[PDB]
Amino acid sequence: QACNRAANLARSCWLLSNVYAEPALQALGDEVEDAFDTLTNSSFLDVAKS
Amino acid sequence: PISADFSEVENAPSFLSLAENTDEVLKPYTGLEIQTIITNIVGDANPNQSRIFDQDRLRGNQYSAGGLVTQNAVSAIPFTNLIPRTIRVGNILVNSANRLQITETNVSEYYSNPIIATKLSEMISDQVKNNQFSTWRRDNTSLQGFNAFDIATINTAILPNGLSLESMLLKLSLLHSIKAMNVDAASINRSQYQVIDHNTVPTIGAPAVVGVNNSPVFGEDCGGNNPVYPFGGGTGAIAFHVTLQTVPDERKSYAIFVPPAILQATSDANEALALFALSMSEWPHALYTVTKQTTDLAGANAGQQVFIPTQSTIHIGGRRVLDLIIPRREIAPNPTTLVAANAMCMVRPQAGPDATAGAIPLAAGQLFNMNFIGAPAFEEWPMTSYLYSWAGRFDITTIRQYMGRLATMVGVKDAYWAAHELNVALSQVAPKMTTAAGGWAAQAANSAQQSDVCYSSLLTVTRSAANFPLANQPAADMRVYDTDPATWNKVALGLATAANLVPEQSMDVPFVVGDARASFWERLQAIPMCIAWTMYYHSRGITTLAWDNAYTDNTNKWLQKMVRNTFSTTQSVGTIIPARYGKIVCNLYKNMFHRAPAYVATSVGGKELHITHFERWLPGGTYANVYSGAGAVVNCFSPVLIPDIWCQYFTAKLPLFAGAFPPAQGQNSTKGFNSKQGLMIHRNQNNNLVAPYLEKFADNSSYFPVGQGPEINDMATWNGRLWMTTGNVQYLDYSGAAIVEAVPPAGELPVGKQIPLLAGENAPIELTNAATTCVPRYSNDGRRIFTYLTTAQSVIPVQACNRAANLARSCWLLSNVYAEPALQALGDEVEDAFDTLTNSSFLDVAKSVAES
Amino acid sequence: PISADFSEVENAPSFLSLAENTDEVLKPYTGLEIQTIITNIVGDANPNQSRIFDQDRLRGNQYSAGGLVTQNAVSAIPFTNLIPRTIRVGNILVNSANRLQITETNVSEYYSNPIIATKLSEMISDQVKNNQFSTWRRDNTSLQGFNAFDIATINTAILPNGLSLESMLLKLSLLHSIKAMNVDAASINRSQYQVIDHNTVPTIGAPAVVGVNNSPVFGEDCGGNNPVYPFGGGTGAIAFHVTLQTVPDERKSYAIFVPPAILQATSDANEALALFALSMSEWPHALYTVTKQTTDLAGANAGQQVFIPTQSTIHIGGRRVLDLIIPRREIAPNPTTLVAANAMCMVRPQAGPDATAGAIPLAAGQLFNMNFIGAPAFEEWPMTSYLYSWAGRFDITTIRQYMGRLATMVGVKDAYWAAHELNVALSQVAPKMTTAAGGWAAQAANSAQQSDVCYSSLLTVTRSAANFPLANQPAADMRVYDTDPATWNKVALGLATAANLVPEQSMDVPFVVGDARASFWERLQAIPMCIAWTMYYHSRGITTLAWDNAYTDNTNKWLQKMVRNTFSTTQSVGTIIPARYGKIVCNLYKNMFHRAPAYVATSVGGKELHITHFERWLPGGTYANVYSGAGAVVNCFSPVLIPDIWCQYFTAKLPLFAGAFPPAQGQNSTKGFNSKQGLMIHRNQNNNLVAPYLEKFADNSSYFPVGQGPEINDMATWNGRLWMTTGNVQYLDYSGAAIVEAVPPAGELPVGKQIPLLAGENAPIELTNAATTCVPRYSNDGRRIFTYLTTAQSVIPVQACNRAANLARSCWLLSNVYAEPALQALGDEVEDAFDTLTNSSFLDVAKSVAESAGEVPATKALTDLQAVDVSSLPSTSDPSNVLSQPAPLMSPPT
Secondary structure (H helix, E strand, O other): OOOOOOOOOOOOOOOOOOOOOOOOOOOOOOOOOOHHHHHOHHHHHHHHHO | OOOOOOHHHHOOOOHHHHOOOOOOOOOOOOHHHHHHHHOOOOOOOOOOOOOOOOOOEEEEEEEOOOOOEEEEEEEEOOOEOEEEOOOEEOOEEOOOOOOOEEEOOEEEOOOOOOOEEOHHHHHHHHHHHOOOHHHHOOOOEOOOOOEHHHHHHHOOOOOOOOOOOHHHHHHHHHHHHHHHHHOOHHHOOHHHHOOOOOOOEEOOOOOOEEEEOOOOOOOOOOOOOOOOOOEOOOOOEEEEEOOOOOOOOOOHHHOEEOOHHHHOOOOOHHHHHHHHHHHOOOEOOOOEEEEEEEEOOOOOOOEEEEEEEOOOOEOEOOOOEEEEEOOEOOOOOOOOOHHHHHOOEOOOOEOOOOOEOOOOOEOOOOEOOOOOOOOOOOOOEEHHHHHHHHOOOOOHHHHHHHHHHHHHHOOOOOHHHHHHHHHHHHHOEEEOOEEEOOOOEOOOOOOOOOOOEEEOOOEEOEEOOOOOOEOOOOOOOEEEEOOOHHHHHHHHOOOEEOOOOOOOOHHHOOOOOOOOOHHHHHHHHHHHHHHHHHHHHHHOOEOHHHHHOOOOOOOOHHHHHHHHHHOOOOOOOOOOOOOOOHHHHHHHHHHHHOOOOOOEEEEEOOEEEEEOHHHOEOOOOOEOOEEOOOOOEEOOOOOOOOOHHHHHHHOOOOOHHHOOOOOOOOOOOEOOOOHHHOEEEEEEHHHOEEEEEEEOOOOOOOEOOOOOOOOOOHHHHHHHHHHHHOOOOEEEOOOOOEOOOOOOOOOOEEEOEOOOOOOOOEOOOHHHHEOOOOOOOEOOOOEEOEEEEOOOOOHHHHHHHOOOOOEOOOEEEOOOOOOOOOOOOEOOOOOOHHHHHOHHHHHHHHHHHHHO | OOOOOHHHHHOOOOHHHHOOOOOOOOOOOOOHHHHOOOOOOOOOOOHHHHOOOOOOEEEEEEEOOOOOEEEEEEEEOOOEOOEEOEEEEOOEEEEOOOOOEOEEEEEEOOOOOOEEEOHHHHHHHHHHHHHOOOOOOOOOOOEOOEOHHHHHHOOOOOOOOOOOOHHHHHHHHHHHHHHHHHOOHHHOOOHHHOOOOOOOEEOOOOOOEEEEOOOOOOOOOOOOOOOOOOOOOOOOEEEEEOOHHHOOHHHOOOOEEOOOOOOOOOOOOHHHHHHHHHOOEOEOOOOEEEEEEEEOOOOOOEEEEEEEOHHHHEEEOOEOEEEEEOOEOOOOOOOOOHHHHHOOEOOOOEOOOOOEOOOOOEOOOOEOOOEOOOOOOOOOEOHHHHHHHHOOOOOHHHHHHHHHHHHHHOOOHHHHHHHHHHHHHHHOEEEOOEEEOOOOEOOOOOOHHHHOEEOOOOEEOOEOOOOOOOOOOOOOOEEEEOOOHHHHHHHHOOOEEEOOOOOOOHHHOOHHHOOOOHHHHHHHOOHHHHHHHHHHHHHOOEOHHHHHOOOOOOOOHHHHHHHHOOOOOEEEOOEEEOOOOHHHHHHHHHHHHOOOOOOEEEEEOOEEEEEOHHHOEOOOOOEOOOEOOOOOEOOOOOOOOOOHHHHHHOOOOOOHHHOOOOOOEOOEOOOOOOHHHOOEEEOOOOOOOEEEEEOHHHHHOOEOOEOOOOOOOHHHHHHHHHHHHOOOOEEEOOOOOEOOOOOOOOOOEEEOEOOOOOOOOEOOOOOOOEOOOOOOOEOOOOEEOEEEEOHHHHHHHHHHHOOOOOOOOOEEOOOOOOOOOOOOOOOOOOOOHHHHHOOHHHHHHHHHHHOOOOOOOOOHHHHOOOOOOHHHOHHHHOOOOOOOOOOOOOOOOO
């Protein structure tokens, strides 16, 4: 069912870099850019360019 | 339509799209094409019986949430017109312990379509003006059989009001639907004798007998040999006259001419006369009683068993005394001796074969002594006695003859159809659902809850509180027009006409009358009516208390306006003005079935206005409510009567919140709507309470703002059904506290009525035979209601709404729904060769369906 | 056709090409296509002169794989309807051990061609309306000897559906099919008596005797001389009425008029009444029997065998009791006294020439005591006994004249022909096959396997589980139309008409209805039906055990669809809708035989659609399967009923995978398809199993993906036949594992039924009488099935696919011919000299009657003149129109 993409599988992982832990509920809201992420986006681009 | 895949759920019409006005003229939805849905069903376990006695039921294969298959599972047809008066208990016939149901009506004057004078009546009035003495001589008479002075006096009046024939045709339709029961046993399906009484099994070998005044209990017999009105008591009075000169004054304006056309309408003119007399007096004139042999579930305890027809309980008209005028054989002056009177008339009225005992006893077939001018003592008969004599001889093909004659004399095509609609809407009835977790349940034998029943309008029936005859304060259920005797006299004599009174070919009488299948067609025609009212009540989540208390003290502003516009509150003179929101129900009917209800034209202010049985109900009833096992009332849900599959399976289009759950174990199994659809969850995790994605609040989060109630939103109702169909829903409010409505024992939902099985059939499994769409949103307090699950229970459904998981729910395997294998080893999508070879034909069928 | 060379099989049509929709008009299949090939009779001949008693086999020379020629080799005609109730055993005739076959029908109302009221009805309504001015109850409205109050009530409340007549015509055709056995033995096939009992021999000299309720075993006599219905177990009731008033109120709505136009012959009319009554009551009213003299294979022992016709056991449900309302001889006041009645009945009914016992006993020829008002008591008869008495008196020649007058009232040509198609489809029947190596086999005498049988559709026939009368009803096998008494009453009296009901001449009745050859001809009409259904089931590889469980299974989504779509279980707008994949079989028929099946219309909202008998079957039955030589069942094959020589010698055009193996010609013999055709060989972990060139998808599906099954491909099927036709195939899994389905003892194939030989005949050799095309591919649990050979066995066949080697085979030595249709009309007819002397007059009087339906010489323009008030006549304010469907508009919103 997972390969078929009608189910998910559960596997362990390192919480490093941009990987964050997932809550059991997933009470999703409307997708929204954070204000801090917009205030500091260009700099983040400058690093990646460098 | 039921759905094979979740793709068929997302693409379903929104509710507001179907509640929209449609312009196109449509066709009547007769039970003859509703017939073909019950038969012609998918299934390999099904013996396809030909007799209509066995075709009484919804048979089908079913598929479990766990992936098992169940063959030829059953779902009873909900409706009936028979109220048992001898319930079986302990497998033996036992006298009933519960009082009889009753209905009423506000008859109204019909000012619409006012009449036009004929050139004949015009010249008559000219002759009265110019004082032409000769034209109304003493012994002048027409070939019609009435003398000229009576015509010259009937014409002198001016009448504003038009003629209707509505209450008349309605009484004829009621007597018809009672007499239809007496036809071959094979022609009437057995489920109808076991909707209220689930422990009784009728015999196919012997026909139901149609008696009168035989009921055992609560004064039902109405005096037996001495017949008396069930409603109000008393005897009426009838007198036959050759002239209006004989009728007592203060009675003259009421007397009815009987045209010769009536008396030549049958093999026995006294019977046509009796039937016209039934046609324009009070109804019921007595309590008719269908009797049928039935046996034990094991066949162990046969006996006759009594049933009172629903049609027999409706109260219409009620005019008590009547004077009938009759045609004369010869051109002679008004009779002076008695023999000169009796020999004179076209037909000499008499009692029918059944005898009566009364203060004024009538020997069987007794002749009436006609009244005359010099009579020492005025002569008269009791009315209930009179009709009681002929109560045994009315017969549906005779009524058919009578109808062909009426159709010839005057139009009958449309009016009889609308009267038939009123008959179905008023006399078809279903028991309140019991709550359960599984597929079948019923209330304990011989109980007050066993006999509670509701209209197709989801209004509960009134129940009598005392012995017959009753002496009630009236509580009318719906308006009807009255048939006016004076206008009838103006028309019968050729003095006047009206725009809807055009004469018709006899072959144009609607085909229902005189046909033995009519009862079955009645039951079938009842279902779509419930579908339209159900989709009305389920779109908004108002609880059953909030409707029950909406016309009494506990009202709100919004409940006040809400009950106000569902019903025919308005009362202009001589009219019936339609409910403002009844129109929405008619729109649902026309969009979901692509068919139309019968219309009656009615004018207000010179504006034309159609009206339908949807638009002419009256406020102040009590709504359908579910019972708990052990009988406790529960009234949290919005009102319901019938299982979802009926709605899903007879409709051509239904709103998105009502569709069937797709079968388990497939890709595209049941899912849900989330934030993108513009919805938001209400968590309350501090108390273990989590609720689905719902509509974004508009200052209506815990109490609704005054005068406002919940808004239509399909997807949120769908999610509410997803939360409910889990086994442990919890009905609380915004803080997570209890609401005032009574609630089901945990996990119960309303479920359809149990009936005995035939061989090879199965009880329905799981939630296949249950209402589900009845989701609460608005409580009597004015507070919102929330459906909660605990935080742990709530995680999978939240993933489903989020579309990262599937849910497993049971379903009917009908039409294009096929069972899903547990693996789903999918291959490349591929059209089958047979599907391409036979595609165009399949398109031709669908085109032919769309054309109609 | 038979193929002459491999060039011809290699150029044969693909299956999809033959299943395409075809748009052309085509003639009916009269069954004479097969007659001119298996018989002396090319052209016409008198049945007496032709001895078609001996014309009951396929004959020809055969060529063996070893090079020998077997002259005068033979094959049986597979189908039959007679069921032995006494089987020969040990040369001595004895009682049957096995219960009788039964069949069920789902009768119901459906929309037919749209219906409209006639002018005669308008005149009647105007007579009533004009009558309303006078205080006289008067009888202007009388017609054809009926009461004026009856014509009034028959003129009321018409039903939209239309009128069918089909169930009526079924009952008539079944009866005819039974009485046609009564003719002399010279013109019934010998084989027809020995399809199931292969050890008996009929005697030419003496005709068969048709009796009723005579059967020795399992209570088959339905009370004998005192009768009851075979299915319900009950007894009917029938009553005759001068007028509708004497009918009890319980059933005044079900009454049927019996129009005067029948009974117009000076031929006994009391019998025509009985045959009108039979064609509307429940069928069967009794179990007919055919007793015939027969003898031992040595000719030594002689006896009278008992048979049950298959027509006599099929249940068309209906009406236990009838009120028949008889026409009055002289227009008159209603007969209040009896002598006014009897001397004025146009016919006075009386029982037929046979006695009956039990309650209400009936002496032969007894007279019914007429019903009239004020009679001392009501009178009726049991109808099973009233019909028991006339049961010996009907015959083919009287049914022909009966239907000839019936045609004058209502057209009966196309309707009868379709009813005859249903007759053949439900009554012709064949025994299940036995596997063997050689050309003949049969099951052990008086065994359950010997008597097991199937329809032309490859569905098995159900058996009774208890002694008659049956206590409980079987499931329906097929659904038919019903005939409403109400609109019958309207149509018989000229009050209503439809485009399908236009009156026809007595000469239009189809030929089968009269002839003594009709039994043989019905026997020949069922073969093309099996050829169609066989190509259908064999195009895909699905096995018998797999069809058997398909409707329900959850292993595979595709299979459920594949069965749900072959049966008729759908509706719209209140009418029946044809099965979706039945149209494929119909097309397949039209394309192979270049003939059109008979059909009937259904009106979907006023749009006519054609239903054929291919489209009206119902789910429930087991599918056809072969038995082992020991009697064990075999599941592995696709359904089969007949040897493939039948399929391939009688088609104008044929599918490629089913063609005959070509004759040896010098170097060449037979050949196989390879990778140049798009195919490829299957190999597995085992090094000693080889499977043919097959599809390329065969490499990637040990199990079919859900939603998908094996696809049409003629060439791989051909290769599968080449592997099968070697004497040593192995039926196995992708891995070489055994499949769950029961398999034949090694190297055996199903083979056609044995019958006794005539002098000079030879038995069929090798695979000349076998089925070959039934190549399994789809297993019950979703696996593929592969045909394997061991390597050393595998080498010559693979090279034959590579066109580098040849494989020996047997064949019939028969050339190809296929005739243009013998007759256009569907009815035989020849000018006599008198037909030419009196030609034009008939030609125009005929057309002047065909337009004259519901006409009278008086027109509205004349009867207006007599009217009091012409504007108020309903014919003025309501010009009549055809009723729309599902229902006419009512209560329009202005």
